[PDB]
Amino acid sequence: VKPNYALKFTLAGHTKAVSSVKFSPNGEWLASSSADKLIKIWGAYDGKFEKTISGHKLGISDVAWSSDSNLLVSASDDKTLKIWDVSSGKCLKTLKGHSNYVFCCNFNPQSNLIVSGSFDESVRIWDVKTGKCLKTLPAHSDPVSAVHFNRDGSLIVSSSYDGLCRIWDTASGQCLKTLIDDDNPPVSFVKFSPNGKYILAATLDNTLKLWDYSKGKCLKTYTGHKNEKYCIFANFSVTGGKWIVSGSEDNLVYIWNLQTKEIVQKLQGHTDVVISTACHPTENIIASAALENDKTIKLWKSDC
């Protein structure tokens, strides 16, 4: 079986390159961030513009939802993160502590902590309630491209331009694992699998890899796309067929069969690099977003 993703909506609004798109855990909303310093909220099913959330002083590289869909956290070149109440649009807290651009962010599954990665080569853990920095991890020797909590929040995974993925004990800050394969290209993205057994990592040699992080073994590689320059997100699609989804620097969305590693679909439409993709939590819907020559977000739907 292959999917049949077809374009349903194109979402215009951002005035510069879009940096990230994320579906709310409750399925209602899509959040986008951009180089234009704005966060936008859109209906997940119709693509209907909902509102703009404003306050960062420079471009935003990432945005992420709390697990109850009530909050967002964003990571900006202004060297802050901001925690937002989505319903009111209020900036609840500004997280100050990184010494350089903040590139990536996530809540833990409980949503009492935030993890952040920066050009300053650190990973930081923040208290959501107080907005204060709890721990700074001297994590990497180059900018940190992605950070993510595992299923129970006991671990953090980080990736970096230094060529490493690392696994951190949330509680102690100890480095529990370093992962790298036979070459040392920059690692541009990483996340845990939905079941928490694997990490999915992108490297800037046109390769996605699925790792068993506990055994430290690469189990699958996904290739065929173009990724040598940008920090492009990748996803597990789990609502229908079990796929891997990623943008690409040839302006397409790539979808692979997770088990077989074969390309099952390529989505054509964007006019620039597809920097970010996201998969809806319950319906077979992909959101894709593109860089400065395009500026749009697209919603695609499949029967499986």
Binding site: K16, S19, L58, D77, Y101, I275, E292
Partner: peptide, 5 residues
């Protein structure tokens, strides 16, 4: 930001 490299 992410939108430049």
């Amino acid at each position: 930001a992410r939108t430049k490299q």
